[PDB]
């Protein structure tokens, strides 16, 4: 699960 900005 990639961070919001990645």
């Amino acid at each position, epitope marked *: *699960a990639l*961070d*919001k*900005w*990645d």
Partner: antibody, heavy 132, light 108 residues
Framework: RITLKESGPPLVKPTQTLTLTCSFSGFSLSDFGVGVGWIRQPPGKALEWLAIIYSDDDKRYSPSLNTRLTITKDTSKNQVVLVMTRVSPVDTATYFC????????????????????????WGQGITVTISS | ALQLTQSPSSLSASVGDRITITCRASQGVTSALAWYRQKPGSPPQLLIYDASSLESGVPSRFSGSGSGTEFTLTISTLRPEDFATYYCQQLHFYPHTFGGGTRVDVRR
């Protein structure tokens, strides 16, 4: 100047529901890409990430606590609420809420995402003891 | 999930020393890593964001470098207020993990 402060009950009994409120000033949860997260710290232990919510209302939770956490925001009151259900003694900890910057913008155009990589301002923290 | 291991877990030092704390991630986190210093009884305080950027108002003796899976925080000249516990935090993958912390105490 950004400041945050946690409030809620200092004592809670097992199986009960814990509602923690983060009231802040200096930014709005309607500002672009801003986030407010919650982190806890059992006495003598390491920091543990719990959840975060952004101004566009995306929410994310620790997978280990997902079923017991609800995070919500009240933009007009400048508050973020975290509700934890079915607490048990291991949930005794100091709970902190914190600000997360959104990308820097230039004439309302996102140009730098490096500032989102940190929780930059923290509240003093609220000690919560869980015991019957 | 993703693991963040700090080293050393504990470290002794004296005022004026140069110390360096390191944090290793189990999978690459690009540059999305932050360092904090937490003094007893207080909340953590942001020192370095995005692996190497100096947070505003933070003293220049603090420095951060690295990207991918290996990062380091170095305090070039330890001051009394630096006797504390330091933490690194990854923000590339959810959940946004914290390392185990490294305690820096007075050497004797």
């Amino acid at each position: 100047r950004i400041t945050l402060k946690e409030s809620g009950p200092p004592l809670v009994k097992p199986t009960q529901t814990l509602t923690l409120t983060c009231s802040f000033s200096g930014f709005s949860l309607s500002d672009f890409g801003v986030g407010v997260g919650w982190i806890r710290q059992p006495p003598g232990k390491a920091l543990e990430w719990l959840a975060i919510i952004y101004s566009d209302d995306d929410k994310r939770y620790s997978p280990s606590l997902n079923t017991r956490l609800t995070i919500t925001k009240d933009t007009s009151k400048n508050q973020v609420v975290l509700v934890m259900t079915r607490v048990s003694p291991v949930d005794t900890a100091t709970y902190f809420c914190a600000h997360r910057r959104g990308p820097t913008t230039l004439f309302g155009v996102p140009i730098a995402r490096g500032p989102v990589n940190a929780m930059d301002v923290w509240g003093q923290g609220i000690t919560v003891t869980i015991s019957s | 999930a993703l693991q963040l291991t700090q080293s050393p877990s504990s470290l002794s030092a004296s005022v004026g020393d140069r110390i360096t704390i390191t944090c290793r991630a189990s999978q690459g986190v690009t540059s999305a890593l932050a360092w904090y210093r937490q003094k007893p009884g207080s909340p953590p305080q942001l020192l370095i964001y995005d692996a190497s950027s100096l947070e505003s108002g933070v003293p220049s003796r603090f420095s951060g470098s690295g990207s991918g899976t290996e990062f380091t925080l170095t305090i070039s000249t330890l001051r009394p207020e630096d006797f504390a516990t330091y933490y690194c935090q990854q923000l590339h993958f959810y959940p946004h993990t914290f390392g185990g912390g490294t305690r820096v105490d007075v050497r004797r």
